[PDB]
Nucleic acid binder design. Structure first.
Ligand SMILES: [Zn+2]
Lengths: 120, 242, 142, 331, 117
RNA sequence: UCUCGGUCGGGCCUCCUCUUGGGGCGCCUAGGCGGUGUCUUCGGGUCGCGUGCAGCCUCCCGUCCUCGCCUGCCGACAGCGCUCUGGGGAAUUCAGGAGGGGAAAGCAGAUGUGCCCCGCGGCGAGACUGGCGCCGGACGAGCUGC
RNA sequence: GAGUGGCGAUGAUCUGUACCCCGCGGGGUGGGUGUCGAUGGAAGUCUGACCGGC
C-alpha cells in the first residue's frame, strides 16, 4: 500500500533533513494523531509517513484526508530514522510539516513537494 | 458561532440551486440535501418543513474549492438543476455530493478519481445518491471511461497535477460540449513552486487559451485559501450555453 | 484587487522578467541599433523573456517593406509569440487589456499616449529607449 | 418541416403514371381526384416528423393494393403495355425511406423482406436481408429466415454462412442452434434422399460444441431431441440420436430428459410390426424409467405430455390406448 | 415557489418572521462592535422566498457546539433577548436619549421657569 | 430622333415646423396622525429577605414628564427625476422581441426487377520469377461489385 | 552457568463537570443530562335565532 515509496538514493535523505530543519523551526507536527489534526485543519504543507510500521493500517488513514485536502504525502522506510530525524527519542510513525508566509524553509518545502509531485 | 439548534432562515443565492442561510450573528452557504436525513462526512445541516422534508447541508469553503469560489464572488458556476458535470479529482465524494445536490435528481455528476480508497468512499456516497456515477480511473486516460461519460455541460477540475491543463484539455476534447463550462481550481505551489503565483495563474490561463478555451473570469480564493485561483472559462465559444 | 500588490508595488514581477514589446519600441530599437535581448538584459540585469503579441506583429507587418528589417528582427524564433483573440488588431488596447488583466508584464513603449495611459494603472514597469540604452520607469529594483 | 417541398417531389414524381391512367380508359377523372388527394395525404403523413412504422405500412399496403386494383381493372379492360414498375419502384422508395427512419423495427424489416420476396426481387432481398441482420444481429427470427430461404433457394454454403454467423451471435436462446441442426439435418435429409453425406458429423459438432455455451441445459438438450427426433428415415440418425442420448447420459445422467430420451430413443426410425414392437420397447424403457430416482414430477409431466403427445395417431391397440390413459391417471 | 431552487416557498410573512428579518438587516447593532458585517442596504429587506430552519448536528462537535434545553429558543429575536449585553443595549439607548433631549423642549421650559422665577 | 445650354416649379436633399412662463406621477423633507417603547415624578399593588422596627427588595398598574422607533399612512415650501392623445387595474383582439424545453430534427445529385454476354475492377486459394534479409514483378482456379 | 518480568508521539503532562461545611473519608444546592411519573401549573372548552325557497 506504499505506492508513493521514497527512494533511498538521497530523496529519503532530503526528506529527513527537511524534517530535522522544520523541527528546528518548530514547523513540525509529530506522530500520527497530530499529523491527522494538521491535515484535517489544513495547516499541513507536506506529510511523510513511515513504511516500517508494524501494522501499516494504523497510518493508512491519512492518505485519504491528504487526498481530500490535496497535500503531498510520501513514505520513508524507517520510523526510527524518522524518529531521530525529528529528535524525539521514540519512533515517529508519521510526520507533518507546515509553513508560514516567509521562510527559506517554505522554499525547501516547495522544492521538496515538487519532487514528491515527480513521484506521484 | 453557528451552534446546533439556532434559528436561521434560508433564502436563495444568486446561483441556481445554491442557498444561503442567514442567522443572527453569522451566515452559512448551504445546498439542498438530495438524500435527506444523512450527512456525508459529518457536517452541520438544516431541516425545515413547508408552511420532515426540506433539508440543507451546510457547505464549507475550507473543505470545498467550489464553495470557496461561490463565497469568493464568482459570476457563474455553469451548473444548475439539470446539468451534467464532469468532476475531476474526486477525493471521497464530498464536493461531489455538493455538486450532486446542485444538479439534483434530474442532473448527473460523473465523478472521476484515481485512488482506490477515495474510490471506496466515493462508492459509498455514490451508492447513496443516484445521480452521481462512480468512475475510478486515471484522468490522464479518458479513453478508459469513454464508454461511461456522455457529452457533459460542465467540467469541474480539482487535480493536483503539473499537467493539469493537458488533462482537462483531453477530457474536454472528448467529453465537453460545443461551448462548454469549465471551472478549474489552480494551486500555484503545485504547478510551479519557484515562480510567483500570479505568473503561474496567468500561464495556466494561457495554456487553456492555446488549448482553445475562452477565459471569462479569474478570482483568487484568498480569505479561505492561499495561492489558489479559480478560473471560469468556456470551451470553443465566448458565451456559455450556445 | 490583484494578487501580489502592496499599495502600488507589484511583488509579482520578479526575474525572469516578462516584457510586452510594442511596434514603437521595435522601430526605435532597430533605429537605435541596440540589440533587444542584450539591452533589456543590460537595463534590468536579469533574464527576460520578451513577448510579442500578434497585434504587434500585425502592425509591423501592416507597415510596409520600409520596415522589413524591423519585422525580420521582430520574428526572432527565440521569443514567445503571444497569440491574442480579439477583432481589432489594435496593439495599445491589446496591451492595456492584457496588463490590466494580469499585471505581471513590463511594457516596452516610447509614446506619450501609451506611457501616459499605463502610468494610470499601478505597479507596472515602462521600458523606454533613451538613444543609447533602455530605461525603466517604475520597477524599484536595479 | 419542409414536408410540402419533399412531398412535392414525390407527388410530381408520381404524376406521369396518373397521366397514363387518365389517358387510358382505366380509371376515371374523379377517381384520379380521390387518388391524387389520398397519395398526397399519405406523403404528408409519411414525411411528417412524428411518424410510425404503422404509418409506413399503411401507405405500403394502400399503394400496393392500388397496384393490384389497377392490375385487375387492367385485366377487365383487356389493356396490355401498362406496367407495375412505377408502383414497385415507388413501394421500394416507401420502404427505403421507412427503414431509413425507423431502422429498429422488425415489423418494417420483415414486411420489407416479405414484399421483396413476393415481387421476386431476390438479389435485392439478400441486400435488405444483410442490412436487417446488421441492425438486428441478436434476432433469431432474421437469422433463421435468411438461412432457411437460402437453403430452399439451394445455396447451402451461403445458408451455412448465415447460420454459422447466426450461431456466433444469437447465443442466449437455443433457438438458432435448433434451427441449424434442423436445417443441416434437413440438408442431410436431402442428401440421403438424393442417394460428407455418408458420415454427417456436422450436427454432432453442433451438439458437442454447443456443450460449451451459456444456454446448454437439460431441457434445451431435450429440445435438441425434439429437433433430431424427426426424419427417422436417414442413414445415421441412430448414430446422432445415440450420441445425444449417450452424451446426456455421460454429462447429465440423472435427469428426466435423459430418461425421456431413454424412453423415446427406439421410436426414432419408425413411423408396421416395429411400431408396437418399439412401442412396447418404450414400455420396457418406460417402466424402467418411471421408477428411476430422478425428478419424478418432471418425468411425470413429460410423460403426460408425451402420452397426450401420441393420441392423434390412428391404427393402435385400444388396450394400449386405454392403459396409457390409466397410466396418466396413475401418475 | 421557485422551480429551479427546489421549491423554496414564498415568504409566509408573519409579524415574528418580519421581526427576524428586521433583526437580520440589523445584526451589526446586535454584535455591538465585536463583529461587523457585509453592509446590505437594500430598501425592501423582506425577500421573496424564505424558509425558517435550524442547525441540526455536526458529527465532530457535540460538547460545546450545541445549544441546550434552555437555549433552543423559538425566534432569533428571542435568542438575542436571551443573550447578554441587553443592559448594554439599554445603556447605549440612554446615551442616545440623553443626547436627543439636549436642548429640545424641557431645556427651553427650564429657561422659561428660570427667567420667570 | 442624337444631344447642349438656360429657368422664382416639383421629385430628391437639407434644418426648422419638438424640447412649453404648462400638466400628471414619483423622489426628498419641516411636520401631523396612528401603532408603540423607554426616561423622569408621585401614588397605589406585589414575589421575597431581614429584626418580620428601620427598611431592603423582583415584578405589576396608573399619573406626571417628555424623548424615541415603525419596509406605517398623510405631507406644504424649496429642489430633483420620469413622463404627457394625464396616471393606474382587469378583460380580450392584433403587431413585434428575447429565452427555455421538446422533435431523427437526416430532399449532396432522388433512374423498377431478374438472368445472360461484353468492359473496368475488387476479394482470393494456389502457383512462378528479378534485384538487395527484404522489396518488387507477373500468373491464376473460383467468387463478387458496378 | 542459564530462563522471566521494564513508562512515553502505537501520545507524557497541564488549564476546567461547581462552590461551600468538616476530619485521602463524609454532607447543602448544582447545571447539563436520559428515563417513567405527577395530582401540580400555563389552561379556560366557541357564538346562540334565524336562514333557504318562491
Ligand atoms: Zn491582441
Amino acid at each position: 500500500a506504499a505506492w508513493p515509496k521514497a527512494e533511498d538514493p538521497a530523496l529519503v535523505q532530503e526528506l529527513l533533513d527537511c524534517v530535522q530543519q522544520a523541527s528546528h523551526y518548530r514547523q513540525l507536527k509529530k506522530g500520527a494523531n497530530e499529523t491527522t489534526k494538521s491535515v484535517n485543519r489544513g495547516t499541513s504543507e507536506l506529510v511523510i509517513l513511515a513504511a516500517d510500521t508494524q501494522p501499516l493500517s494504523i497510518v493508512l488513514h491519512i492518505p485519504l484526508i491528504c487526498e481530500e485536502k490535496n497535500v503531498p504525502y510520501v513514505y520513508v522506510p524507517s520510523k526510527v530514522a524518522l524518529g531521530r530525524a525529528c529528535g524525539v527519542s521514540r519512533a515517529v510513525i508519521a510526520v507533518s510539516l507546515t509553513s508560514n508566509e516567509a521562510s527559506d524553509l517554505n522554499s525547501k518545502i516547495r522544492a521538496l513537494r515538487d519532487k514528491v509531485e515527480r513521484l506521484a | 458561532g453557528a451552534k446546533a439548534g439556532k434559528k436561521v432562515i434560508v433564502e436563495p443565492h444568486r446561483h441556481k440551486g445554491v442557498f444561503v442561510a442567514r442567522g443572527g450573528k453569522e451566515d452559512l452557504l448551504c445546498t439542498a440535501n438530495l438524500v435527506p436525513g444523512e450527512s456525508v462526512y459529518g457536517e452541520k445541516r438544516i431541516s425545515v418543513e413547508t408552511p420532515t422534508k426540506t433539508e440543507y447541508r451546510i457547505w464549507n469553503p475550507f473543505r470545498s474549492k467550489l464553495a470557496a469560489g461561490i463565497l469568493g464572488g464568482l459570476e457563474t458556476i455553469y451548473m444548475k438543476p439539470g446539468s451534467k458535470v464532469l468532476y475531476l479529482g474526486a477525493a471521497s465524494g464530498t464536493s461531489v455530493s455538493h455538486v450532486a445536490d446542485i444538479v439534483g435528481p434530474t442532473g448527473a455528476v460523473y465523478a472521476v478519481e484515481f485512488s482506490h480508497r477515495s474510490g471506496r468512499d466515493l462508492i459509498n456516497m455514490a451508492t447513496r445518491r443516484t445521480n452521481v456515477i462512480p468512475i475510478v480511473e486515471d484522468a490522464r486516460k479518458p479513453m478508459a471511461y469513454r464508454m461511461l461519460v456522455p457529452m457533459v455541460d460542465v467540467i469541474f477540475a480539482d487535480v493536483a497535477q503539473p499537467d493539469q491543463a493537458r488533462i482537462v484539455g483531453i477530457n474536454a476534447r472528448l467529453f465537453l460540449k460545443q461551448g462548454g463550462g469549465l471551472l478549474i481550481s489552480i494551486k500555484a505551489s503545485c504547478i510551479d513552486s519557484t515562480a510567483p503565483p500570479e505568473q503561474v495563474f496567468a500561464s495556466e490561463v494561457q495554456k487553456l487559451r492555446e488549448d482553445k478555451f475562452f477565459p471569462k473570469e479569474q478570482l483568487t480564493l484568498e480569505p479561505y485559501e492561499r495561492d489558489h485561483a479559480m478560473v471560469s472559462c468556456v470551451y470553443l465559444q465566448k458565451e456559455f450555453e450556445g | 484587487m490583484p494578487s501580489s500588490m502592496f499599495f502600488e508595488h507589484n511583488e509579482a514581477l520578479v526575474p525572469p522578467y516578462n516584457v510586452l514589446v510594442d511596434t514603437n519600441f521595435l522601430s526605435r530599437t532597430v533605429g537605435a541599433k541596440l540589440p533587444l535581448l542584450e539591452s533589456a538584459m543590460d537595463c534590468l540585469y536579469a533574464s527576460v523573456n520578451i513577448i510579442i503579441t500578434s497585434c504587434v506583429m500585425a502592425e509591423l507587418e501592416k507597415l510596409g517593406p520600409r520596415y522589413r528589417v524591423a519585422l525580420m528582427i521582430a520574428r526572432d524564433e527565440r521569443w514567445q509569440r503571444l497569440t491574442c483573440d480579439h477583432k481589432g488588431t489594435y496593439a495599445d488596447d491589446c496591451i492595456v487589456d492584457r496588463v490590466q488583466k494580469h499585471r505581471i508584464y513590463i511594457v516596452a513603449t516610447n509614446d506619450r499616449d501609451l506611457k501616459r495611459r499605463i502610468r494610470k494603472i499601478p505597479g507596472v514597469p515602462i521600458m523606454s529607449v533613451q538613444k543609447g540604452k533602455y530605461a525603466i520607469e517604475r520597477l524599484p529594483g536595479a | 418541416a419542409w414536408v410540402a417541398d419533399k412531398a412535392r417531389f414525390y407527388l410530381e414524381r408520381a404524376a406521369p403514371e396518373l397521366r397514363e391512367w387518365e389517358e387510358k380508359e382505366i380509371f376515371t377523372k374523379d377517381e384520379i381526384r380521390n387518388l391524387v388527394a389520398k397519395r398526397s395525404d399519405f406523403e404528408h403523413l409519411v414525411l411528417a416528423p412524428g411518424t410510425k412504422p404503422t404509418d409506413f405500412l399503411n401507405y405500403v399496403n394502400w399503394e400496393r393494393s392500388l397496384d393490384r386494383l389497377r392490375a385487375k381493372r387492367c385485366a377487365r379492360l383487356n389493356i396490355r403495355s401498362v406496367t407495375s414498375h412505377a408502383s414497385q419502384a415507388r413501394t421500394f422508395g416507401i420502404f427505403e425511406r421507412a427503414v431509413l427512419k425507423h431502422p429498429g423495427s422488425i415489423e418494417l424489416w420483415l414486411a420489407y423482406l416479405e414484399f421483396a420476396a413476393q415481387v421476386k426481387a431476390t438479389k435485392r432481398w439478400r441486400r435488405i436481408m444483410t442490412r436487417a441482420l446488421r441492425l438486428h444481429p441478436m434476432n433469431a427470427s432474421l437469422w433463421t429466415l435468411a438461412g432457411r430461404r437460402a437453403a430452399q433457394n439451394g445455396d447451402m454454403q451461403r445458408a451455412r454462412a448465415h447460420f454459422l454467423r447466426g450461431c456466433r451471435f444469437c447465443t442466449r436462446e437455443p433457438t438458432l442452434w435448433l434451427e441449424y441442426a434442423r436445417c443441416e439435418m434437413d440438408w442431410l435429409a436431402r442428401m440421403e434422399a438424393k442417394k460428407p453425406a455418408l458420415s454427417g458429423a456436422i450436427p454432432i459438432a453442433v451438439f458437442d460444441v454447443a456443450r460449451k455455451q451459456p444456454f446448454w441445459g437439460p431441457a434445451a438438450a431435450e429440445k435438441f431431441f425434439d429437433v433430431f427426433a424427426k426424419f427417422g428415415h436417414l442413414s445415421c440418425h441412430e448414430r446422432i440420436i445415440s450420441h445425444v442420448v449417450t452424451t446426456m447420459q455421460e454429462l447429465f445422467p440423472n435427469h428426466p430428459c435423459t430418461w425421456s430420451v431413454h424412453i423415446r430413443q427406439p421410436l426414432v426410425g419408425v413411423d408396421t410390426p416395429a411400431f408396437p414392437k418399439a412401442l412396447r420397447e418404450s414400455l420396457a424403457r418406460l417402466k424402467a424409467a418411471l421408477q428411476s430416482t430422478t425428478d419424478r414430477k418432471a418425468l411425470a409431466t413429460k410423460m403426460v405430455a408425451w402420452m397426450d403427445g401420441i393420441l392423434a395417431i390412428e391404427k393402435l391397440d385400444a388396450a394400449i390406448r386405454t392403459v396409457l390413459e390409466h397410466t396418466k391417471r396413475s401418475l | 415557489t421557485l422551480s429551479d431552487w427546489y421549491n423554496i416557498p414564498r415568504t409566509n410573512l408573519t409579524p415574528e418572521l418580519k421581526r427576524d428579518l428586521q433583526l437580520l438587516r440589523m445584526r451589526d447593532v446586535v454584535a455591538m462592535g465585536k463583529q461587523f458585517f457585509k453592509k446590505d442596504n437594500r430598501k425592501d429587506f423582506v425577500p421573496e422566498y424564505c424558509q425558517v430552519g435550524t442547525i441540526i448536528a455536526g458529527a465532530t462537535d457535540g460538547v460545546s457546539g450545541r445549544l441546550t434545553r434552555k437555549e433552543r429558543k423559538r425566534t432569533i429575536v428571542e435568542e438575542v433577548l436571551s443573550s447578554d449585553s441587553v443592559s448594554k443595549y439599554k445603556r447605549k439607548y440612554h446615551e442616545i436619549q440623553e443626547h436627543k433631549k439636549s436642548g429640545r423642549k424641557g431645556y427651553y421650559k427650564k429657561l422659561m421657569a428660570a427667567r420667570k422665577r
